[PDB]
Amino acid sequence: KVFERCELARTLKRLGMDGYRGISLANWMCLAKWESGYNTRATNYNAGDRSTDYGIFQINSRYWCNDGKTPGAVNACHLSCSALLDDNIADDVACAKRVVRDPQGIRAWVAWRNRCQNRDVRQYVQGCGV
Ligand SMILES: [Ca+2]
């Protein structure tokens, strides 16, 4: 499913992402935007390391979910990568929260540093009533 901007913003707020481990809602919106374009079915194969990025947050199969075909992989979220491709982002969110609980936090996603860090990210939540 492809979310509309404000519809996702309101969903994330309900799911408790605003201020999670110090990360503002606008940051999470910025990340979802550059990672998947707000598409829950998004998938990216990394030919280079044989891992795949899944879902709205492009969660990588080497560490966070199990797809069975990633060598030397762990499944820190205790989820099938499969679960990150449906239309319900409740587990995606629970997993994203798990990612940022690691030392690195949101920096774990290079697109955040490239596209969101030290930027005015208000654009992503303006007018959404969140
Ligand atoms: Ca899901």
Swiss-Prot record:
This is Lysozyme C. The active site is at 35, 53. Coiled coil: none annotated. GO terms for molecular function: identical protein binding; lysozyme activity. Belongs to the glycosyl hydrolase 22 family. Gene3D superfamilies: 1.10.530.10. Disulfide bonds join 6-128, 30-116, 65-81, 77-95. GO terms for cellular component: azurophil granule lumen; extracellular exosome; extracellular region; extracellular space; specific granule lumen; tertiary granule lumen. GO terms for biological process: antimicrobial humoral response; defense response to bacterium; defense response to Gram-negative bacterium; defense response to Gram-positive bacterium; inflammatory response; killing of cells of another organism. Its EC number is 3.2.1.17. It is found in: Secreted. Lysozymes have primarily a bacteriolytic function; those in tissues and body fluids are associated with the monocyte-macrophage system and enhance the activity of immunoagents. It catalyses: Hydrolysis of (1->4)-beta-linkages between N-acetylmuramic acid and N-acetyl-D-glucosamine residues in a peptidoglycan and between N-acetyl-D-glucosamine residues in chitodextrins. The gene is LYZ. It comes from Homo sapiens (Human).
